Symmetry: C4
Amino acid sequence: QFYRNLGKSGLRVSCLGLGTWVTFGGQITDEMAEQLMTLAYDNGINLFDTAEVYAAGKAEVVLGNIIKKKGWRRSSLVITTKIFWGGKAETERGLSRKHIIEGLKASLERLQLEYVDVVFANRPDPNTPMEETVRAMTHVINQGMAMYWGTSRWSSMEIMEAYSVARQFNLTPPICEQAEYHMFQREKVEVQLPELFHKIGVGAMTWSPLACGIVSGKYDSGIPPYSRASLKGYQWLKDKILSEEGRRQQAKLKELQAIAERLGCTLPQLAIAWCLRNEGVSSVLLGASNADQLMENIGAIQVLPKLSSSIIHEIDSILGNKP
Amino acid sequence: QFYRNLGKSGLRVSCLGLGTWVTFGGQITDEMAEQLMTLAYDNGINLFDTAEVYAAGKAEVVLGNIIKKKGWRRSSLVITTKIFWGGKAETERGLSRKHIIEGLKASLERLQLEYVDVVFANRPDPNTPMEETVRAMTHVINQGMAMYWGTSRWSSMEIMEAYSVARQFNLTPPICEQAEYHMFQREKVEVQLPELFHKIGVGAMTWSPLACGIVSGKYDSGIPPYSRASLKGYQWLKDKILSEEGRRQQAKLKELQAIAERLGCTLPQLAIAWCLRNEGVSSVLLGASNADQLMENIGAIQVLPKLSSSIIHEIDSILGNKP
Amino acid sequence: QFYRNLGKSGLRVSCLGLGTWVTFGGQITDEMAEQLMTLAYDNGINLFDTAEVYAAGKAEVVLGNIIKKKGWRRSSLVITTKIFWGGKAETERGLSRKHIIEGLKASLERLQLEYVDVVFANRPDPNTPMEETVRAMTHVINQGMAMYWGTSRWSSMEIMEAYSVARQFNLTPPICEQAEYHMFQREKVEVQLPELFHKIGVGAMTWSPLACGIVSGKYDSGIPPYSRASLKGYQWLKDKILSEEGRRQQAKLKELQAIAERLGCTLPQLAIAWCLRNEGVSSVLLGASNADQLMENIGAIQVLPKLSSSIIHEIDSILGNKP
Amino acid sequence: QFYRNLGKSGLRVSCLGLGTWVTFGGQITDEMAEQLMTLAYDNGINLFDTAEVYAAGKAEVVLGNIIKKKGWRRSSLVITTKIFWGGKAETERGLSRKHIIEGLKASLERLQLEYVDVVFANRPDPNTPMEETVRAMTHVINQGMAMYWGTSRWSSMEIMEAYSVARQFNLTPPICEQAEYHMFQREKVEVQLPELFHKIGVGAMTWSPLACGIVSGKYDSGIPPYSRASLKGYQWLKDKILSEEGRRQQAKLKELQAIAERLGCTLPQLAIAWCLRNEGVSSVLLGASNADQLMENIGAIQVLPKLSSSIIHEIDSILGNKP
Ligand SMILES: NC(=O)c1ccc[n+]([C@@H]2O[C@H](COP(=O)([O-])OP(=O)(O)OC[C@H]3O[C@@H](n4cnc5c(N)ncnc54)[C@H](OP(=O)(O)O)[C@@H]3O)[C@@H](O)[C@H]2O)c1
Ligand SMILES: NC(=O)c1ccc[n+]([C@@H]2O[C@H](COP(=O)([O-])OP(=O)(O)OC[C@H]3O[C@@H](n4cnc5c(N)ncnc54)[C@H](OP(=O)(O)O)[C@@H]3O)[C@@H](O)[C@H]2O)c1
Ligand SMILES: NC(=O)c1ccc[n+]([C@@H]2O[C@H](COP(=O)([O-])OP(=O)(O)OC[C@H]3O[C@@H](n4cnc5c(N)ncnc54)[C@H](OP(=O)(O)O)[C@@H]3O)[C@@H](O)[C@H]2O)c1
Ligand SMILES: NC(=O)c1ccc[n+]([C@@H]2O[C@H](COP(=O)([O-])OP(=O)(O)OC[C@H]3O[C@@H](n4cnc5c(N)ncnc54)[C@H](OP(=O)(O)O)[C@@H]3O)[C@@H](O)[C@H]2O)c1
Ligand SMILES: [Cl-]
Ligand SMILES: [Cl-]
Ligand SMILES: [Cl-]
Ligand SMILES: [Cl-]
Ligand SMILES: [Cl-]
Ligand SMILES: [Cl-]
Ligand SMILES: [Cl-]
Ligand SMILES: [Cl-]
Ligand SMILES: [Cl-]
Ligand SMILES: [Cl-]
Ligand SMILES: [Cl-]
Ligand SMILES: [Cl-]
Ligand SMILES: [Cl-]
């Protein structure tokens, strides 16, 4: 099924989405951004993710411009944005009512949209009571600025707290968690999220399926120019890649590449298909700095049929990290 | 009583309404559409039903144009529309919050109205949780896009689930089910709906009282040109008419025609009066492809006084399908 | 206390108000209407009552014009309107959600106001479920078309049903009943309403304190020209006045007039002061067809200090109708 | 921590704010007002407090003009206003629904803002039921005219009543009490408010930290010209200052001044730092009639590090009023 429900909700998303972290308003030109969105949409992708923090609001401006220039029906799109870091002032960050309302409004203005389909808490906020946050998310939904809301990088326990508060005060529960998932980061999505889906219907929209591009194997011989790890502000990622653990995972990619070759697909295709083997994952958010990557990555769908129980066991043997 | 309450609600509808399936924006010209609406309204009909799916939104455009051109008071009209199929994109169908809000908005824009009196779920949606659907219907009512909501082609059990959810979360329950009812399709309206009316006050607004025109007897000698069953896209109905069961019901119409003759009315008049003999039916939605049919059908009201216990028993004997 | 709380609510009304039944848009010219309102407002009256039914919406147009021409602060006024009969179509009457929303909107448009302070159900509606009515009143309050709501001519039992429904579904209860009260119609206000005020805080705003002018004594020798009972459409009142019971109450007025003379006030002043002796009555709605009547009637306040236990017992002896 | 949460809420305020009582639209010129706000904002103060009663709405006009002229981001500001006395008409005062909605609207218009961050009940209203007041505050929050609400000069018991009502009817509780606190008025903030913070999360935003300027010592030799106590309308404060108790507290200031000298700070710096020693106080609202006072007072932050347990015990010994 190319389209599936986002969690237990009635919202149907393509099993792949396109995100805008690093790229839109940042690494890539607005023309390249339009090309990516066009290729995505034309291949049936309906799901597009952004954040007020991405390129200091510029990702939102670019994405919104593209939607307006292309004239696509709003009802054919699922646009998601994430709130937490909205500026340098003390009151421009967090999940307070003030910042959720203010942040979402400013995002909608940059997007040139009346609403997003899903507004996410971009991370948890230990400085704001959960009740305030859930009331605030309910309020923006009830005011028609969002259709639904979700969490990102919250613990299962914090998600269930949101649910508890919604049920105690008759507010709207979140429908999705946006969680990291790839071959080297599996536990939350494979173990915790299933339990949460079965108990309160929260779905999983996953991110960094290539671990920021590491899974492509491109860092085998160091840091290529123009790679994410080469860019100003991503020394943290350069450090991860060049860590002992980074090199240990690079070694595993060589073994995985052999499986890809046998399937006649690329390692990224294999890695993204692997993420979707899981029917509990509603959608995998793709990142791409160029159209060739995006077109390749969308081919992961054609790999899904080849992912037998024996291939999956072979991958688990290589990775050594089944949770 | 020509006017009656739609269910337990305070909304008073004429016991006949005029629908727009097949005809408006489709089979008939906009001029014929205006003629029908004018004849209806002038005879005291206040109830007009349409759907976002009818003629791909054109039925709504035509109906809305007529209201605006005639200048009729909005407060004198009961306009109903039905949401489910709103386009070809994945997210343009169903009873998700996204589609209910989006679908109803687009319908209101086509209708050139600020609100409908009743928004219906056009069919059930196994892909959307009932809670989401009822919250969404509550939301459009609370935002002033609809006064009330209803269901169509839902089981008694699904209607009661909507009621359960409304009472559990203090949302708005539906006030009406729009169900098929005619001499050859009786069980839901005669058996189930009464129980539902008594338990949770949901009323019945019925449709296809002539079984798409079959009850007129016009298909006795095959498929007349210009008949609904002759039109592009209605081969399904041609197939029903020309089925063994279609011919078995045609044979019964000959016997019913004898009763009509004795009452000095037409078979359609008899059939529509028969539907209204039931005080549990709030209104019967008429269809008409021309004004003569509509004018004839409205004469069913004059037949109602002649429908004795003995006539009704004679009809049950002929039909052989009392549930 | 010239000003008092309307029931248990925080709304403070003058102990006299000015109503618009018969007069505004009807019996009196718009100039006379402006004169009355000006005299009222200038004497500290803040409370002005009207209805969509009064002179077919013209009372509302006149009252709204006067407010706009005078430039009075909206925050200094307490405007009340009453919904039930809003037109000739089936759906233009009653306390359905459709009619409450539609009726109040049209009233606000005629009044040229964004909201009324109090919207009243003008009478009870046996054809609309109480839940719908209370939800609808809650909705117009929550949408900012009214600040509060009330009932008129409802039984204590129906008022308490409204309260029950508000508490069961967390809706807004009514704050006031608008009830008839004068020397010949006492039971509801003197017996029932006190109990209702103590149990659920509902106050009493009373009407026809002169029994449509009968209490002035003007009908002693028949029906004077220009009197309310002389006007087209008030034969019912002529019939009451000229009934055996009408004449029995006229005879009592002669005895009451003797008490007025001893107090050095007019019979209407005595009658209105008598209505206000009751601290449970929040305000008495005055009617006046000319400014002399209004100015006289406002003088009732100066009579209140003279209304001893012995005077009140003398009046009860004359009336013979203490409940 | 210069910034802290306002109570248990997610709203983060600077530990000092700037108020507008007496000064804005009143004692000081609009130019001086802009200077004060600029100095405050530039030093990281985000919290600005006003009232519809201050200078009959002029404080609000001045504050709003300054915000608009400076172009400061709305999301970087925390604006608070207080409702109770909004005019001379009977219905222009109190915490009725009518006055809260009307008062807040008029304030927002004067401020030229779409919303305030916090709307306060400026005092308690024994003439309005708590339920009405809390429903009304919930309503203006839900309509987007305020983000949060608070109380001012309410007893702990009345605050907890607001909380009870919010929880019983699923309304929004208040997040803060605005209470007087200074070296001569300690009991409510030091004893009661802590208990309230721990039980229902209500924070404390304190006012008159210099007891209207008395704490500066400026009244040692009588009433200086241009002092608050010299102004038309402040004879009450002149009377306090020149009372036996006023002189008893003046004598203590001489002893406190010795502590200030040893710390190398001014008495006002000492007094404001003393108010903030308390982590339960979220913010202290400053008043200043000139920029030198404001700049001095902001230096209280630099005194906070010097406030040892032994200094605090010395101050308690001098004051003799530890509660
Ligand atoms: N909720 C959250 O906190 C959160 C956090 C992170 C991401 N996300 C979402 O998830 C989306 C995807 O995350 P991600 O961008 O980190 O995804 P990813 O797939 O892990 O990394 C994408 C990056 O890898 C490289 N790449 C992609 N396909 C490739 C291919 N076929 N061959 C070689 N290199 C390839 C590109 O980087 P180069 O520059 O090296 O070419 C591309 O920008 C984001 O846009 C965002 O919407 C959400
Ligand atoms: N909720 C739902 O899913 C749903 C589904 C179906 C319908 N409905 C509603 O119900 C309305 C009525 O349904 P329907 O149109 O199927 O009603 P119907 O009465 O069963 O069929 C009407 C059709 O029968 C023919 N006809 C009508 N009167 C006639 C007469 N006196 N003599 C000969 N033929 C006559 C006409 O067809 P010809 O073209 O043959 O002349 C006319 O278009 C619709 O417009 C719609 O609003 C709702
Ligand atoms: N909730 C409801 O169903 C309802 C029903 C009725 C009324 N009300 C409200 O109550 C208001 C007052 O009712 P009402 O008008 O029936 O009040 P009322 O005091 O019983 O009757 C007023 C009429 O009596 C005459 N009058 C007044 N003062 C007089 C005086 N000093 N001397 C001689 N005649 C005098 C005038 O009639 P003439 O034409 O004879 O001069 C005047 O129009 C109405 O406007 C309406 O707002 C509400
Ligand atoms: N919720 C409420 O009922 C309520 C009530 C009162 C206040 N408040 C809030 O609290 C804010 C502060 O209150 P407040 O103005 O009474 O505060 P305050 O600090 O007690 O008094 C400030 C006044 O003291 C003098 N002053 C300030 N700093 C000085 C210094 N360094 N040296 C000498 N004199 C100095 C100035 O008066 P001079 O004119 O003498 O120079 C100044 O206007 C108000 O603006 C208002 O926002 C709220
Ligand atoms: Cl928490
Ligand atoms: Cl995560
Ligand atoms: Cl990573
Ligand atoms: Cl379900
Ligand atoms: Cl609730
Ligand atoms: Cl059906
Ligand atoms: Cl059929
Ligand atoms: Cl009822
Ligand atoms: Cl009454
Ligand atoms: Cl009468
Ligand atoms: Cl109270
Ligand atoms: Cl205080
Ligand atoms: Cl003081």
